[PDB]
Design a protein around this ligand. Structure first.
Ligand SMILES: [Mg+2]
Ligand SMILES: [Mg+2]
Ligand SMILES: [Mg+2]
Ligand SMILES: [Mg+2]
Ligand SMILES: [Mg+2]
Ligand SMILES: [Mg+2]
Ligand SMILES: [Mg+2]
Ligand SMILES: [Mg+2]
Ligand SMILES: [Mg+2]
Ligand SMILES: [Mg+2]
Ligand SMILES: [Mg+2]
Ligand SMILES: [Mg+2]
Ligand SMILES: [Mg+2]
Ligand SMILES: [Mg+2]
Ligand SMILES: [Mg+2]
Ligand SMILES: [Mg+2]
Ligand SMILES: [Mg+2]
Ligand SMILES: [Mg+2]
Ligand SMILES: [Mg+2]
Ligand SMILES: [Mg+2]
Ligand SMILES: [Mg+2]
Ligand SMILES: [Mg+2]
Ligand SMILES: [Mg+2]
Ligand SMILES: [Mg+2]
Ligand SMILES: [Mg+2]
Ligand SMILES: [Mg+2]
Ligand SMILES: [Mg+2]
Lengths: 181, 258, 181, 44
RNA sequence: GUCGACGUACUUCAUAGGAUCA
RNA sequence: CGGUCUCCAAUAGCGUAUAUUGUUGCAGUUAAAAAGCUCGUAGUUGAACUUUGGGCCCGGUUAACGGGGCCUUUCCUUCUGGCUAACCUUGAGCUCUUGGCGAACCAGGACUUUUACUUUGAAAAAAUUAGAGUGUUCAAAGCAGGCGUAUUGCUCGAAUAUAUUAGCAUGGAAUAAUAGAAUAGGACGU
RNA sequence: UAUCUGGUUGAUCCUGCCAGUAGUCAUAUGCUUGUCUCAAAGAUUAAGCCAUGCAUGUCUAAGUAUAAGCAAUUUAUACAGUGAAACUGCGAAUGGCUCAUUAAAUCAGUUAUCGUUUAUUUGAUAGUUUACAUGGUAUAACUGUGGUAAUUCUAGAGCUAAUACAUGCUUAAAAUCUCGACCCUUUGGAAGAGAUGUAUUUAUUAGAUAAAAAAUCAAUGUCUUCGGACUCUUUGAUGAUUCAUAAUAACUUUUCGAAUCGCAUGGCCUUGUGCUGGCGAUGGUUCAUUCAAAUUUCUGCCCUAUCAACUUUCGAUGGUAGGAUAGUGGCCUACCAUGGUUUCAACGGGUAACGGGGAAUAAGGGUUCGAUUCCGGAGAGGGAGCCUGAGAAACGGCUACCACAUCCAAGGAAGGCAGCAGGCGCGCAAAUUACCCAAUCCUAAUUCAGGGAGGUAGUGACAAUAAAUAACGAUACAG
C-alpha cells in the first residue's frame, strides 16, 4: 500500500476550561477579534505554547551551543518575519514574553479592519470570506491568514471584486435592469 | 519467501535516491549487475528524477530502446540497470557525459565531465588471484575481471581502466598521504588524505582520514577509495570537493549567494 | 520421509521443542544406496541446483592406486573383508567408503614385471637396470601378490560419486588391518 | 495457546493428535460437567 | 436442603471541633 | 366550560453507558505488616595500605580553566628491516658538500594477568519523533521550488539531531575485583 | 487528586470532614450532518463455511507455419508480409492476504562460511574431439474414425518441423613424457609409434624461505684455456589452510568444446554460384560479481517455585567410521564411553504470545498498547508425502487420510476466498458482485500483451485541515 500521509491536531483542550477568568478572557478575545468559536483561541494558544516551550528548551541549553544558536536564530527570524516579534527584541527571552493577542492581531481579519477597508472585524470577515480581499495579486478568503510584514502593504480590494474596479455584483445589475425596464 | 524477490517498496528503497513517498507504492528494483542494490542508481532514477529528460517510466523505456544511453561505453536497454559509483554515462544525442560520484550530502550527483575524462574510469581492486591455467587476474569493485595484471597491484589499490579496451592503464597503491574518497557510512561523499591505517587481524581495518580543513575522521577500510595523490586526483571532483560544512556555515554561504 | 533438521531433536538442556514450521525441501534426505558387488548398475540422482549425483547400486570394478609405486590400475573387486563401522556390511558385501576389500592383483603384477623386469631388447634391459635399485617392496604386499588377491581400502563414496576407487593397503595401515582381521 | 479450546475440534482432528503426542512427551515426567460430577458423588 | 467453610462482588454504622451572638 | 417562556456550555458537531508497588520513593510500638529462638547453603555486602610531592618547557582558550612534554632512583625487552635527524668532520658560500657514526620515528616477528567502570568514533534501514528552508490562496501537508523571458534559458534544495543493552575500535587509570617469588619448581646474564 | 458548588446548627466566622465536579484513549450506542483538502476500512481468541464472476500469462528483424487463415503478388517455384492452433523457452517460488502455531523458537543489533547451492545480470573464458551439415531410434497442432450423462476427460489410425529429442566431424606450431625397430658396446645413439584441452573420482607431488661457510658417497648435466670450473637460477594470497594454481598415474552407463537465427553484401583474385568477411540475437564450460538461499557466533523475551530436579529403554552429551545432504552437524546408522541442563530458576504449565521499527501517557523514573501502510517469520480447512524446476515440501500444483460439501442417467466426476468484489454464521442488519492499466512498478520471446499488484470513482461524521449560515444603515416601539 501507499505510504502514509502525516496529519496532526492544530489545537488542544485547555487543562481547566471552566475557570471563570478564562471564560471572561475568551469572551473578550472573541468579541475584540470577531472569532467564530473557542476553537480558534485554543488553536492560537496551542501554537504559542509550542513556540514558548521550544524557546524555553533552547534557553536551557548553554549559550554558544551550536544547536541553541541555529534553532534560536531560525525561530526569532520566523517570529520577526510574521510580525509577532519586533526587530529590536531579537532574543529568546522576549520570545517567552509573547501573548496570544500578538498572533491574533496579525490575522488577515484584524489587518483588513485596521487598514480601513472594513468598518468592523465582522465586516472584515465577511469581506474576506466573500473574496473581496487580495494580498498582492492573490485573492485570499481565509480570515486566519497570517499577514507578513512585507505582505502588510499589499492588502487591497481584489481586481475581480466589485469594490476593486470590477463590474457590479449580481444585486446591483439586477436592480439596475429592473429600474431600466 | 520461496525464492528471490522481484518488487521493492518505496519506503524500503535506498534513501539517497530521493524518491517521493506519495508518488506510488513501488520503486524501481535495480536488476542484477555490477553494483550492489543499495549502492546503485538505476537508470530510470537518473534519467527521470535527476536529469528530468523523461517524465515517466515509459518515456525512459522509449529513450533506452533508441540506444541513446551508454554505460561505461556499452549501450544498455534495461530501465533498472544498476549504474553505480565511478560509472560513465554517455548520451551522444545531447553530447553529454556524466560520472556518478557522490556529493557531500551522500547522494549521487549530476556531475558532467569531458570526453577525454569519459574515456576512462577508476576501480578499487577487490581481489587478486590466479585463474585457470595459472593466469593472474584482478577483480575490481564493479565486477570487472582483468587478466594479466601488473604484479605490483595488490588489494585496496586503485586501477585506472580504459573503457575502450577495458585494460589497466595505470594504478595507485594504498599508502599514507594518498587522496581518498569515502564510499560508505555517515562520512559518505567526503574527500581527504590517509594519515594512518590501523590494522586489526581477524577484524575490520580502520583508516584515519584528514580533510583539507584539517578535520580528522575514522572510517572502515571497506568504504575507502583511493583516487590519487594529495591535490592531484585522477578524476574531476564535484562541486565542494568533498568538504563537509556545518549547518551554520551552509546557512551563511546560502544567504551570501542569495 | 528423511529429514536432516535439528529442530526435531531435544535441546541441549533436554527441553522438548515444538514444531516451528513444516518440513522444508532444502533440508531433505534420501534413501541409502547399499552398493553391492555385481554387474554394474548406476542411476543418476538430480540434486539441489542442476547438479547430478550418481548412485552405484552395483559395481564390480574400480580404480585402485598403488601409492608407493605411484600408479593406479582398474581391477576387479573380489569382496569386502572388513568394515570399521558395522559388520553386517561385511556380511552382505556392501561397498562403502573405508571398507576393506580384496582386488585382483593381475594388472599390478603385470605392470611391476614390465617396469622392473622382476617377479613377485637393449632398451628394456637398460631401463630395468636403471630402476633396479627400487625393485624391492614390502614382504606383506608380495605375499598377497603370490596369493592373487591384494588388500585395498576404498577411498571413494560409491553412493555419491558412483565410483569404487581406492588404494592398496601398505605399511602400518596394512599391519593394523591384518591384526584386526 | 497450545491446548486452548477450538471452535470446531472435529474439523482439525489431526492437529489435535499432535497436541496429545506433545503432552505425552512433555508431561512424561509426571505420569511416570459439574452436574455429572456431583451426580457421581451423590450416587456413591 | 431458606446446609457449613472458603473465594468473589457489594451494602451499612460509627464527624464534627473552637470563638462569638440569642 | 365551549370549541378543531427565559438563560447557560460546545458548535457541523454534541450526548449517553462500560472501562480507564516506592530503584529515585512507601510502611511495620500505640489500628495493615518483624518469623518463638538460634545455627546455616545459595544470594547481597564486606577495614586500611603499594607513585605521593616537587623543579622546568611547549602550545590553547576566556589572571582562572583545561591539554601535552621532560627532570626528579621512575624510560617495556629483544631481533630484523626502512628512512634518517642530530653529532663529528673535509671542501664551497646559518646554507650546500666529502667521509664516518647512525638517535628518534615507522613496519614486521618474538615477548605478553585478566576484567568491571567511564570518555570518544563507527553501527543501530526507510517511514515515524524533534527540526532547517519553502505564501500548498491559509493550514493539515508535500518536497517542492525560485529568477529572468522579444529570443534562446539560468538556478538553490531534498539539511541536522535522537536512539537503550550486546558486539567492534579508542583515551583514561580514580573506585572495585583478579594473578604473581615461600619446600623457590623465582628474576636477570656478553 | 486540584479548582468550584453544596451539607455538616438557634444563627455568623475559623478549621476539619463528607458528596458532586478532571482527563485523553478504547468499546457500544443515540441525535445532527451544508462547502474545500485528506485519509482508513480487522476482531464471536469463528485460521468458522462459501453460490457467482475475476485475480498469470507471455513473440521480437532475430527458435518451429504448405492454417485447405487474411492481404498483398509476380520480391521473390524452397520460405520470405501479418498470423489463429500447437511444439519450444521463460514466468507461474514475485505480488496480495491472515496472525493459527511458536517463550532462546521467531525477531533486533552483531558475527561466520577456510562449511555450502546460486536461474538471471555484469567481466573474463574453450586451435587439442556426411561436415557445402546426420537420424526417427517422432510427435504436437492438423485430417479422419469414436466412447462417456458429465469435466481444462480423451482412445485408434494417417501426416509433418526445431535453439525439442538423439547423434556426430572439421583448425597452428612447438614442447615434454612414455614404448621403442635398428646400429653399437659407446659418456651410447636412435627411425618411428603413441599420449596431452576441459568435466568427474581416487592416489601422490610442488605451493620455498632468521640469517653464513665446507668435505665426501651415488646418479649426472653444461663448459673451457683438458685443467678443473660451473654465476644472474622459480614460486602468489590469508591473521591462519590440505588455499588459488600447477604436475604425475589412471578412472567415467560421464559432461562441455555452436549441425542455431536476424540484417547487410564489403575485400581478393588464377572468373569459379571460388577464397575471405561486418553488426547483432540465442545457447555453452569454468572462475569472479550481482540478486538470493541455507546454516551460524555473542547478548537480549510476559505470568508461574503451592512447577525442583530434568534429559538418557524409542539420541539425551561426546568420540571413531560410515550413510545421507548443496554442504558442517546425532541429521541417521554401527560400536563405544556416561555424559549434558539447573535456585545466576533448568524442566513443566499459562498466554485474549507472530517479533521489531513504532503509539499513548508521564516532570523524571516507569506503565501499557503494537492483527493493522516498512522489515523478517509462519499458513493457505487439519495431518502426511511428493513431481517439476536455479529456487516450492507450492496448495488460484498433485496424491492419500480426517471433516465438510457440489453434479450424477448412481456407473462415476469435481473441491478449497487467511486474494478483489459479494454472501452465511440470528430472528436484529453497515463499502461496489463499479471503471482502468493513464501513473508506480512487476512478468514475458518482450517499447507494443498481461497485472482485482496498483490506481480512479462510489459508500455510515474512523482519524485530521480550513470554513459559510449574513454585513452596512434608517424608521418604529419599550424602560
Ligand atoms: Mg467572482
Ligand atoms: Mg575475515
Ligand atoms: Mg553465604
Ligand atoms: Mg575496601
Ligand atoms: Mg554500545
Ligand atoms: Mg444515526
Ligand atoms: Mg442550512
Ligand atoms: Mg463551490
Ligand atoms: Mg507465408
Ligand atoms: Mg512449455
Ligand atoms: Mg511454554
Ligand atoms: Mg539465541
Ligand atoms: Mg530471464
Ligand atoms: Mg555470461
Ligand atoms: Mg499417431
Ligand atoms: Mg562424520
Ligand atoms: Mg545410534
Ligand atoms: Mg503482544
Ligand atoms: Mg495466538
Ligand atoms: Mg505487529
Ligand atoms: Mg508456505
Ligand atoms: Mg476458512
Ligand atoms: Mg501444501
Ligand atoms: Mg484461493
Ligand atoms: Mg500463492
Ligand atoms: Mg474478500
Ligand atoms: Mg528469440
Amino acid at each position: 500500500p501507499r505510504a502514509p500521509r502525516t496529519y496532526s491536531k492544530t489545537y488542544s483542550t485547555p487543562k481547566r476550561p471552566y475557570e471563570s477568568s478564562r471564560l471572561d478572557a475568551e469572551l473578550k478575545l472573541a468579541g475584540e477579534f470577531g472569532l467564530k468559536n473557542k476553537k480558534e483561541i485554543y488553536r492560537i494558544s496551542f501554537q504559542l505554547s509550542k513556540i514558548r516551550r521550544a524557546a524555553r528548551d533552547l534557553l536551557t541549553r548553554d549559550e554558544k551551543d551550536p544547536k541553541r544558536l541555529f534553532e534560536g536564530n531560525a525561530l526569532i527570524r520566523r517570529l520577526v518575519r510574521v510580525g509577532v516579534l519586533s526587530e529590536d527584541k531579537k532574543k529568546l527571552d522576549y520570545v517567552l514574553a509573547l501573548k496570544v493577542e500578538d498572533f491574533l492581531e496579525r490575522r488577515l481579519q484584524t489587518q483588513v479592519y485596521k487598514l480601513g477597508l472594513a468598518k468592523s472585524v465582522h465586516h472584515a470577515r465577511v469581506l474576506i470570506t466573500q473574496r473581496h480581499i487580495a494580498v498582492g495579486k492573490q485573492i485570499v478568503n481565509i480570515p486566519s491568514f497570517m499577514v507578513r510584514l512585507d505582505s502588510e502593504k499589499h492588502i487591497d480590494f481584489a481586481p475581480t471584486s466589485p469594490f476593486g474596479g470590477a463590474r457590479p455584483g449580481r444585486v446591483a445589475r439586477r436592480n439596475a435592469a429592473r429600474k431600466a425596464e | 519467501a520461496r525464492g528471490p524477490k522481484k518488487h521493492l517498496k518505496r519506503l524500503a528503497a535506498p534513501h539517497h535516491w530521493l524518491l517521493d513517498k506519495l508518488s506510488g507504492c513501488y520503486a524501481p528494483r535495480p536488476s542484477a549487475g555490477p553494483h550492489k542494490l543499495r549502492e546503485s542508481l538505476p537508470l530510470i532514477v537518473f534519467l527521470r528524477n535527476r536529469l528530468k529528460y523523461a517524465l515517466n517510466g515509459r518515456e525512459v523505456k522509449a529513450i533506452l530502446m533508441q540506444r541513446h544511453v551508454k554505460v561505461d561505453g556499452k549501450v544498455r536497454t534495461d530501465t533498472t540497470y544498476p549504474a553505480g559509483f565511478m560509472d560513465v554515462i554517455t548520451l551522444d544525442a545531447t553530447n553529454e557525459n556524466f560520472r556518478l560520484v557522490y556529493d557531500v550530502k551522500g547522494r549521487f550527483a549530476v556531475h558532467r565531465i569531458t570526453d577525454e575524462e569519459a574515456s576512462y574510469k577508476l576501480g578499487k581492486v577487490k581481489k587478486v588471484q590466479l585463474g585457470k591455467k595459472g593466469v593472474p587476474y584482478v577483480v575490481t569493485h564493479d565486477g570487472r575481471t582483468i587478466r594479466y595484471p601488473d604484479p605490483n597491484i595488490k588489494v585496496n589499490d586503485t586501477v585506472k581502466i580504459d573503457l575502450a579496451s577495458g585494460k589497466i592503464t595505470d594504478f595507485i597503491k594504498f599508502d599514507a598521504g594518498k587522496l581518498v574518497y569515502v564510499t560508505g557510512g555517515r562520512n559518505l561523499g567526503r574527500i581527504g588524505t590517509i594519515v594512518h591505517k590501523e590494522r586489526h587481524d581477524g577484524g575490520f581495518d580502520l583508516v584515519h582520514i584528514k580533510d583539507s580543513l584539517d578535520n580528522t575522521f575514522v572510517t572502515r577500510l571497506n568504504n575507502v577509495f583511493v583516487i590519487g595523490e594529495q591535490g592531484k586526483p585522477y578524476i574531476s571532483l564535484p562541486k565542494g570537493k568533498g568538504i563537509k560544512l556545518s549547518i551554520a556555515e551552509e546557512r551563511d554561504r546560502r544567504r551570501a549567494q542569495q | 520421509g528423511i529429514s536432516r533438521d535439528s529442530r526435531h531433536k531435544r535441546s541441549a538442556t533436554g527441553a522438548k521443542r515444538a514444531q516451528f514450521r513444516k518440513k522444508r525441501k532444502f533440508e531433505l534426505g534420501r534413501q541409502p544406496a547399499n552398493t553391492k558387488i555385481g554387474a554394474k548398475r548406476i542411476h543418476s540422482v538430480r540434486t539441489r541446483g542442476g547438479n547430478k549425483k550418481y548412485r552405484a547400486l552395483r559395481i564390480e570394478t574400480g580404480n585402485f592406486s598403488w601409492a608407493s609405486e605411484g600408479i593406479s590400475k582398474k581391477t576387479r573387486i573380489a569382496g569386502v573383508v572388513y568394515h570399521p563401522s558395522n559388520n553386517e556390511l561385511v556380511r552382505t558385501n556392501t561397498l562403502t567408503k573405508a571398507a576393506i576389500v580384496q582386488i585382483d592383483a593381475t594388472p599390478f603384477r603385470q605392470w611391476f614385471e614390465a617396469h622392473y623386469g622382476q617377479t613377485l631388447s637393449k632398451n628394456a634391459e637398460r631401463k630395468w637396470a636403471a630402476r633396479a635399485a627400487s625393485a624391492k617392496i614390502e614382504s606383506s604386499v608380495e605375499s598377497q601378490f603370490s596369493a592373487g588377491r591384494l588388500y585395498a581400502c576404498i577411498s571413494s563414496r560409491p553412493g555419491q560419486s558412483g565410483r569404487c576407487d581406492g588404494y592398496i593397503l601398505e605399511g602400518e595401515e596394512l599391519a593394523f588391518y591384518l591384526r584386526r582381521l | 495457546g497450545t491446548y486452548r479450546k477450538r471452535f470446531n475440534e472435529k474439523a482439525r482432528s489431526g492437529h489435535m493428535a499432535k497436541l496429545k503426542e506433545l503432552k505425552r512427551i512433555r508431561n512424561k515426567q509426571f505420569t511416570r460437567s459439574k452436574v455429572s460430577r456431583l451426580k457421581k458423588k451423590r450416587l456413591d
